[PDB]
Design a binder for this molecule. Structure first.
Ligand code: HEM
Ligand code: LVC
Ligand code: CL
Length: 393
């Protein structure tokens, strides 16, 4: 009753061009079985959204990667928010929610916007730059580590650690084994920076520790919550901003609409999140026998959600393969959905908005003028190099 497919969603060929395989995954049925990894898969919007909003059946406490925490030991201590279910998830979620709250955005916006405007002006003086190294990575590195309150020493470990984190959600393929092997130096740095003495007062890290006074988290939980932000707060925005620039480079008509109305910056970034879905997939584990799309899934089964496929499902989106900065993007699952929806989504959107604002006001054209190279990761979709020429407005 359930179609069995041999597609490896974590193969380089899949990363290189996943859209044909994603349609095959959607059209095969509402629920598929991937024989390559012995997991169930859902690629349509309806089922993906349903699974995300059914946390008591499709839990996260057994890991959101392929590995089942009930069967294998996690490569690192489990995340207190991402890899937990209610009610354990609730209070740590509230702390991060308050640390990264709307009120908090008010304190960082001006600095974040200034850094974006300055970076775009700097890149315009160069002309031909790498939109990844010089923009997608440079800007987040210039604002987020400081917003966390991190020291200068050791920041070179931040992106390597993130790449490891997101590769480790995948199956035990070469990408994951290479990332976990000899990762101790990255882990030692991050875990050290998670301790209260190493976080500058006023930053996200210190603010997390400050919440230990309230009873919402204990002092020994605060380092693991800081670890969450250090795991998810940087690499995500790199591929998010990189996706937006990549879209603007490929759709000149949409860059021109953005130029004509810079207030579309925020929704231009949101559409890029839908269009590219920098976070491609996550797993859930069934806590009981459950019927999904006419298929009966047993207990303790892994279920792979194709967030990117769901964001391009023609059953839900008109012209899903078109970048449209005025699209009504509400309902896309690029940030998740339900109790686990991205708690850092205001930080991501703030970075994306202010960078696209800067481009909208300062740049007239973005032309790809060099070899484009894709960056392969079991969970993240993004580019390794994006040579572009920036024409000043
Ligand atoms: C474009 C940028 C980003 C994207 C596309 C993204 C995507 C996501 C997604 C899809 C989830 C759901 C995970 C799941 O359902 O298992 C999630 C959760 C989470 N994200 Fe984001 N994220 C981004 C940026 C950030 C930032 C900037 C931060 C922190 C500063 C962050 C921190 C977190 C945390 C802590 C969670 C766990 C939430 C929970 O389990 O309740 N992310 N993110
Ligand atoms: C896209 C994204 O943020 C996924 C993610 C979320 C939380 C954590 C964590 O360490 O708690 C790690 C990864
Ligand atoms: Cl770690």
């Amino acid at each position: 009753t359930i179609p069995h497919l041999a597609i490896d969603p974590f193969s380089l060929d899949f990363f290189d061009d996943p859209y044909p395989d994603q349609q095959t995954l959607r059209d095969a049925g509402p629920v598929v079985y991937l024989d390559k990894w012995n997991v169930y898969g859902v690629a349509r919007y309806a089922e993906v959204h349903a699974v995300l909003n059914d946390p008591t059946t499709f839990c996260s406490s057994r890991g959101v990667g392929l590995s089942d925490f009930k069967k294998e030991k996690p490569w690192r201590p489990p995340s207190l928010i991402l890899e937990a279910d209610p009610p354990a998830h609730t209070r740590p979620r509230a702390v991060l929610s308050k640390v990264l709250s709307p009120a908090t955005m008010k304190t960082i916006r001006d600095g974040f916007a200034a850094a974006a405007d300055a970076k775009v002006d700097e890149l315009l003086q160069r002309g031909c730059i790498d939109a990844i190294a010089d923009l997608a990575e440079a800007y987040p590195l210039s604002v987020f580590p400081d917003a966390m309150g991190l020291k200068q020493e050791g920041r070179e470990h931040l992106l390597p650690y993130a790449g490891l984190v997101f590769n480790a959600f995948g199956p035990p393929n070469e990408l994951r084994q290479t990332a976990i092997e000899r990762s101790a130096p990255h882990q030692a740095y991050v875990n050290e920076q998670c301790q209260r003495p190493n976080l500058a007062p006023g930053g996200f890290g210190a603010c997390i520790h400050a919440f230990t006074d309230t009873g919402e988290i204990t002092p020994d939980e605060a380092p693991l919550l800081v670890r969450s932000l250090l795991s998810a707060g940087l690499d995500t925005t790199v591929n998010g901003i990189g996706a937006a620039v990549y879209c603007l480079a490929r759709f000149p008509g949409e860059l021109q609409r953005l130029r004509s109305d810079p207030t579309l910056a925020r929704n231009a970034f949101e559409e890029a999140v839908r269009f590219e879905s920098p976070v491609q997939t996550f797993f859930r584990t069934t806590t009981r026998e459950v019927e999904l799309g006419g298929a009966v899934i047993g207990e303790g089964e892994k279920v792979l959600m194709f967030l990117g496929s769901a964001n391009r499902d023609p059953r839900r989106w008109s012209d899903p393969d078109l970048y449209d900065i005025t699209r009504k993007t509400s309902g896309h699952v690029g940030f998740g959905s339900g109790v686990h929806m991205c708690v850092g989504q205001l930080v991501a959107r703030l970075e994306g908005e202010v960078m696209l604002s800067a481009l909208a006001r300062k740049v007239a054209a973005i032309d790809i003028d060099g070899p484009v190279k894709r960056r392969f990761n079991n969970t993240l979709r993004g580019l390794e190099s994006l040579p572009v020429k920036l024409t000043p407005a």
